[PDB]
Amino acid sequence: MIGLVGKKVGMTRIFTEDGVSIPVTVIEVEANRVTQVKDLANDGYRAIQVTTGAKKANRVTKPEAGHFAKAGVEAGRGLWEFRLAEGEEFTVGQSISVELFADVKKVDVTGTSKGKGFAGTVKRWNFRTQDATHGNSLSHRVPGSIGQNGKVFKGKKMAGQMGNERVTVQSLDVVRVDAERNLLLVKGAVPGATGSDLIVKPAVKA
Amino acid sequence: XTXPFXX
RNA sequence: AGGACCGAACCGACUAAUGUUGAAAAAUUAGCGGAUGACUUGUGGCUGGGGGUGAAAGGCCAAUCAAACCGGGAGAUAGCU
RNA sequence: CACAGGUGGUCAGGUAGAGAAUACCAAGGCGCUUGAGAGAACUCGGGUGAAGGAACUAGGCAAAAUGGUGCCGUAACUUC
RNA sequence: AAUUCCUUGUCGGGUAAGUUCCGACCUGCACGAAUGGCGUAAUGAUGGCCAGGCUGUCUCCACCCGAGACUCAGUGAAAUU
RNA sequence: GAUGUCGGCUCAUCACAUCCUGGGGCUGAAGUAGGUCCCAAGGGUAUGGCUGUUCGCCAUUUAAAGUGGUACGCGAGCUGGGUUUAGAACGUCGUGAGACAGUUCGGUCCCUAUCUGCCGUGGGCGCUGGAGAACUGAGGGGGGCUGCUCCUAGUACGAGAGGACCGGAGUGGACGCAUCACUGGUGUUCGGGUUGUCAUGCCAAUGGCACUGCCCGGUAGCUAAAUGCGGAAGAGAUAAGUGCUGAAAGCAUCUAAGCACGAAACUUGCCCCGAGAUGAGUUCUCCCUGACCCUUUAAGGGUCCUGAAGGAACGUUGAAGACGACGACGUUGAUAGGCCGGGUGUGUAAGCGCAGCGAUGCGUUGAGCUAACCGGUACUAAUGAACCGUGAGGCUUAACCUU
Numbered sequence: 001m002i003g004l005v006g007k008k009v010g011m012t013r014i015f016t017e018d019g020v021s022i023p024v025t026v027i028e029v030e031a032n033r034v035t036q037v038k039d040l041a042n043d044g045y046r047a048i049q050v051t052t053g054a055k056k057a058n059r060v061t062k063p064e065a066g067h068f069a070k071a072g073v074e075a076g077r078g079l080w081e082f083r084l085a086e087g088e089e090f091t092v093g094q095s096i097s098v099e100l101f102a103d104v105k106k107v108d109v110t111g112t113s114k115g116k117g118f119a120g121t122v123k124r125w126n127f128r129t130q131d132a133t134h135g136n137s138l139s140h141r142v143p144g145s146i147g148q149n150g151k152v153f154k155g156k157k158m159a160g161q162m163g164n165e166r167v168t169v170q171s172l173d174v175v176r177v178d179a180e181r182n183l184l185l186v187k188g189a190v191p192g193a194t195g196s197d198l199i200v201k202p203a204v205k206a
Numbered sequence: 207x208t209x210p211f212x213x
Numbered sequence: 214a215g216g217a218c219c220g221a222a223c224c225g226a227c228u229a230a231u232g233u234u235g236a237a238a239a240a241u242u243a244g245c246g247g248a249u250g251a252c253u254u255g256u257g258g259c260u261g262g263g264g265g266u267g268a269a270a271g272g273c274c275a276a277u278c279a280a281a282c283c284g285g286g287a288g289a290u291a292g293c294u
Numbered sequence: 295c296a297c298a299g300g301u302g303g304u305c306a307g308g309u310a311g312a313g314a315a316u317a318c319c320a321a322g323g324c325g326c327u328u329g330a331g332a333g334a335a336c337u338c339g340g341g342u343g344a345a346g347g348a349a350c351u352a353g354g355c356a357a358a359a360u361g362g363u364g365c366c367g368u369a370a371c372u373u374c
Numbered sequence: 375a376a377u378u379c380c381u382u383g384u385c386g387g388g389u390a391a392g393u394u395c396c397g398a399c400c401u402g403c404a405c406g407a408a409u410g411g412c413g414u415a416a417u418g419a420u421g422g423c424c425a426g427g428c429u430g431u432c433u434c435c436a437c438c439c440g441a442g443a444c445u446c447a448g449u450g451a452a453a454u455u
Numbered sequence: 456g457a458u459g460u461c462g463g464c465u466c467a468u469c470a471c472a473u474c475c476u477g478g479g480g481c482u483g484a485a486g487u488a489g490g491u492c493c494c495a496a497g498g499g500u501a502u503g504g505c506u507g508u509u510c511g512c513c514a515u516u517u518a519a520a521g522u523g524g525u526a527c528g529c530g531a532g533c534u535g536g537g538u539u540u541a542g543a544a545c546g547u548c549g550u551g552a553g554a555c556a557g558u559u560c561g562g563u564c565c566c567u568a569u570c571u572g573c574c575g576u577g578g579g580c581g582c583u584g585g586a587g588a589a590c591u592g593a594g595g596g597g598g599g600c601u602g603c604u605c606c607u608a609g610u611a612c613g614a615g616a617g618g619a620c621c622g623g624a625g626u627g628g629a630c631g632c633a634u635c636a637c638u639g640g641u642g643u644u645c646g647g648g649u650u651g652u653c654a655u656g657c658c659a660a661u662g663g664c665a666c667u668g669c670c671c672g673g674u675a676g677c678u679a680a681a682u683g684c685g686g687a688a689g690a691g692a693u694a695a696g697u698g699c700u701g702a703a704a705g706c707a708u709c710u711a712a713g714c715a716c717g718a719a720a721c722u723u724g725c726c727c728c729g730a731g732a733u734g735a736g737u738u739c740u741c742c743c744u745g746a747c748c749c750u751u752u753a754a755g756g757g758u759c760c761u762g763a764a765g766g767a768a769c770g771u772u773g774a775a776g777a778c779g780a781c782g783a784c785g786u787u788g789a790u791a792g793g794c795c796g797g798g799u800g801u802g803u804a805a806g807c808g809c810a811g812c813g814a815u816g817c818g819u820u821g822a823g824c825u826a827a828c829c830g831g832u833a834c835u836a837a838u839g840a841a842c843c844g845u846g847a848g849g850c851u852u853a854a855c856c857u858u
């Protein structure tokens with residue numbers, strides 16, 4: 001079904017009763033609110049529009065003010081969309097909590113990766129470094145050949161921006177769901193740095 | 207002259 | 214005592230990297246070899262071009278050497294471009 | 295060339311040191327005729343490194359360390 | 375063998391495995407006695423080989439300090455066409 | 456009037472005459488394990504010793520260690536051992552100078568990228584009122600490997616020995632993405648020890664220089680050797696192949712009409728880019744409801760008033776970044792810095808006092824110091840402003856308004 005939007009608060013260690021340490025990626029999934037409910041008669045696909053968080057009064061734009069005021073829902077920090085699986089129904093102004101993930105046992109998180117900036121072939125494509133001595137001339141961490149005896153094929157692995165892109169990790173085990181704190185304990189690591197917004201949706205890969 | 211250019 | 218030892222100056226230049234329209238038309242950095250001797254160095258002088266000199270490499274003889282540079286024969290000759 | 299060049303001689307302080315080495319200073323003389331900011335790949339010059347330790351490579355290039363003083367002790371071979 | 379074509383000769387030693395290396399055999403393609411022969415302590419920035427130690431040489435690269443690369447103002451370059 | 460040659464390194468890419476994995480036919484296929492042939496190129500496809508070597512032999516692995524094309528791929532990408540200069544020797548030929556595809560030692564590999572191309576990143580214009588967001592997904596990339604073990608089952612088979620497909624589960628190797636909580640590295644911006652030396656007037660106490668002077672530790676951040684995830688399942692149409700029905704051709708036949716199975720290929724489903732998709736898309740919301748002149752009287756020009764929504768610029772800045780860009784905040788404010796507290800790290804400061812001949816030790820004291828981290832705080836600085844873009848959005852047609 002649908003997912004939710006939260007914040008990467010960080011990572012901590014969870015000790016069970018048998019003395020095992022389960023890595024977790026805590027997420028502050030604030031109470032979400034629906035903004036739009038779209039159908040096929042107008043748009044052409046069953047989905048919803050959800051926001052979260054808050055924003056300053058004298059900083060948000062007027063166009064969005066009416067977009068949020070239309071549904072009588074306080075402004076958020078962004079907007080996202082979730083497709084419905086032919087069996088989901090919602091209404092504007094409806095608030096969604098973290099309990100939605102109570103009986104799922106697995107999710108696929110999504111978020112933006114960290115920013116490495118301009119990266120090299122080694123940092124980026126795990127290229128094999130050349131000889132550091134024994135003759136090498138200014139060609140230690142260089143790629144080498146990029147073709148044959150007359151064009152560089154498209155998709156050629158080269159240096160460039162590394163990170164700051166959409167990334168989706170799949171099949172992450174859930175550990176705990178504390179609605180009192182609006183938290184979600186996801187096992188393992190997830191993209192993005194502390195404070196970045198990320199999506200959490202049930203796992204399709206089982 | 208010496209081999210490859212210009213050894 | 215020593216064409217002796219370790220090792221600075223000094224004289225050399227084995228290796229590597231840099232540099233290679235260089236800082237430099239052969240160097241820099243890191244180490245390296247001889248370092249009282251067939252040592253090294255300053256000033257001055259002499260051997261002069263098919264000749265000089267040469268612990269000899271066809272090496273050097275003013276950034277040019279299997280026969281210097283300059284001038285002249287000379288507008289050499291070029292069945293080749 | 296306002297040159298990372300070459301070089302003949304003379305003067306030769308203090309602490310440590312065997313020393314004209316080396317390290318910090320004195321005398322005295324300089325900061326090397328463009329700079330500011332940022333802190334990406336890659337290159338150059340360096341520092342550190344988990345575990346393994348020449349498996350690298352045509353070949354162990356450099357680095358580090360052994361590195362100094364005193365004492366004990368010291369093989370084959372030898373023209374002694 | 376600084377010499378051996380056939381050839382990585384054959385055997386042995388060393389290595390888990392050694393066209394190289396050492397030690398022997400001799401079938402010396404084509405060693406050989408002052409264009410010297412066989413040895414030879416010491417010496418060698420000499421060639422080849424095996425060890426100990428040492429390490430980012432490597433497995434496999436990671437991070438950091440600096441000089442450039444990048445941006446701004448100034449000067450303003452050079453090569454091919 | 457120059458197309459630089461073996462091999463190695465690096466980076467790869469296509470073909471299929473398939474090395475492995477997958478799917479099948481016959482088998483002198485009992486089983487296990489092989490042989491032969493067909494379909495199949497999705498992905499994957501050893502390390503080392505000797506040698507300059509490719510190759511090859513050897514050792515030990517692996518599910519397998521594929522065959523070839525790409526200037527025997529790749530030197531404006533590296534190397535320079537080999538080939539391929541001048542030096543010098545051996546053997547051999549020649550009287551000799553010298554020479555050999557005979558060997559042996561030694562021996563300068565330059566180029567700041569204009570165009571194409573490729574990896575990335577922006578400006579401008581356009582998409583027909585403009586602006587702010589959220590999407591559709593035409594299309595285009597990424598990914599696709601696999602061993603072992605247990606149960607099924609010591610079952611079927613077989614005289615035994617030996618030993619299953621089908622199906623299920625778990626755990627690994629290699630590769631790949633993300634991440635820094637743990638284990639660790641780094642940490643020349645934290646602390647301490649300490650040699651030599653100069654200085655701060657001197658003692659004490661500090662600082663500078665010597666690779667951060669040499670060392671021992673270590674925060675954040677980055678990062679792997681560290682720890683989490685991943686390959687699929689499933690569906691449709693198919694290859695070889697197996698078929699049902701069934702005539703032509705009274706029988707037979709997988710086929711001609713019809714119909715059902717069928718693989719890691721292909722199309723899907725998983726992930727990312729994605730409306731410059733000029734075929735330029737779709738939804739919601741917000742802002743502008745002037746006065747005239749003149750004129751080749753028109754999608755015309757100009758003046759006065761008007762200047763919104765929003766944007767940009769500027770500034771404080773970022774787990775964003777080469778520059779642009781992207782993101783956060785700008786006094787109605789915690790954006791940065793500082794300050795307060797706390798934590799971490801270092802490891803009992805300084806000073807005085809006590810003991811001791813003194814070096815030193817003890818107590819004050821787990822003291823003092825403390826970078827980038829956590830939580831808070833307007834103390835300072837992010838300034839009122841102006842700069843920016845307007846004024847109802849063409850013609851035509853059809854249906855509506857005035858079904």
Ligand SMILES: C=CC[C@@H]1/C=C/C(=O)NC/C=C/C(C)=C/[C@@H](O)C[C@@H](F)Cc2nc(co2)C(=O)N2CCC[C@@H]2C(=O)O[C@@H]1C(C)C
Pocket residue numbers: 207208209457458459460539540
């Ligand atoms: C002592 C020096 C060895 C000597 C070299 C002669 C010489 O003059 N070399 C200069 C290189 C010229 C080049 C690279 C010209 C390109 O524009 C065309 C070439 F690419 C074509 C090509 N060359 C080859 C084969 O095909 C070829 O054989 N060579 C090219 C590299 C040297 C090698 C050669 O000629 O070596 C000789 C050997 C044999 C005595």
